[PDB]
Every structure is written in structure tokens, then in C-alpha cells.
Design a protein around this ligand. Structure first.
Ligand SMILES: *[C@@H]1O[C@H](CO)[C@@H](O)[C@H](O)[C@H]1NC(C)=O
Lengths: 49, 50, 49
């Protein structure tokens, strides 16, 4: 505890994120809606807008 | 700061990795070079202002 | 993991150093986040940990 600011311990957590190559198993709090076909619509498929 | 020290370092092998042990500073602030790449290239003169 | 405050900046893509060369090397193409916080109250011990 007598050390300086550069010699003090730091706890590090590194979150490495995979791409959408595999099934998107970790997905955030977004509520999915019903699918509408044959119409000019905006779409958000697993973060692909 | 109005009478800042200036020491010329020359004719020696410079190892910049011991500065972290010498001083409790958090990080460098290097402008023309990179602090990780300082152990490779050789300099003509180096001046330590303080 | 737990490191020193001098070597927090070594946890980055394309960087070299002691822990970045011998303990934990991040791929230069690392797509993710690094969260480092001070833990001088917990990890430090009086007389040395
Ligand atoms: C600085 O010099 C003193 C003089 O004895 C020494 O004890 C100490 O280990 C040196 N290094 C640091 C980082 O204080």
C-alpha cells in the first residue's frame, strides 16, 4: 500500500467477442417482432441492419 | 521549472525497460517514436530535461 | 487476471512488453473490450503480497 500509482495492483477483465459466423447465442435485450414478407421494410437480423 | 536540469547522456547502451522500475509513472507520452520500439533503434544523442 | 499499473497499457493489440510477451498476448485483430480497475484495497497487503 505504500507504493505509487504505477506500482499499485489492477484487476483486468478482457471480454473477447466472436463474430456472427456461428449461431448468435449471446444476444442483448432486444424484443423480436413478427416477420413481414413481400414488402419494402427495414430489417434487423441478429444485428445486421 | 525556470532552472530546469538538462543532462546529456552519451556513449552507453540504453535500456528503457528499467524506467518502470525506476519511477512510479503510469505511462510514457512519446511523440516521434513508440515506447515499445525504443529498445531497437540507436540514437545519436539523448538529453534528459528535468 | 491481476497486473501492475505500469503494464496496464501492455494489454492492447500490437503491443510488446513483459506480460505482453510472456503472460498474455492479445491478437493484433482483437475485437473486444478491456476493463481495468484499481484494486489497492483488496490485492495489496501490508508488507507485500
Ligand atoms: C533509489 O535509490 C535508493 C538509494 O538507496 C535505493 O534504496 C532505491 O532502491 C532506488 N530505487 C527506487 C525505485 O527507489
Amino acid at each position: 500500500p505504500t507504493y505509487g500509482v504505477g506500482h499499485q495492483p489492477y484487476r483486468v477483465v478482457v471480454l473477447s467477442f466472436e463474430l456472427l459466423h456461428a449461431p448468435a447465442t449471446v444476444c442483448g435485450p432486444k424484443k423480436s417482432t413478427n416477420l413481414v414478407k413481400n414488402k419494402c421494410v427495414n430489417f434487423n437480423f441478429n444485428g445486421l441492419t | 521549472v525556470y532552472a530546469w536540469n538538462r543532462k546529456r547522456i552519451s556513449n552507453c547502451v540504453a535500456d528503457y525497460s528499467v524506467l518502470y522500475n525506476f519511477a512510479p509513472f503510469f505511462a510514457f507520452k512519446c511523440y516521434g517514436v513508440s515506447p515499445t520500439k525504443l529498445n531497437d533503434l540507436c540514437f545519436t544523442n539523448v538529453y534528459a530535461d528535468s | 487476471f491481476v497486473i501492475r499499473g505500469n503494464e496496464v497499457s501492455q494489454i492492447a493489440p500490437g503491443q510488446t512488453g513483459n506480460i505482453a510477451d510472456y503472460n498474455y498476448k492479445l491478437p493484433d485483430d482483437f475485437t473486444g473490450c478491456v476493463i481495468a480497475w484499481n484494486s489497492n484495497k483488496l490485492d495489496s497487503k501490508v508488507g507485500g503480497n
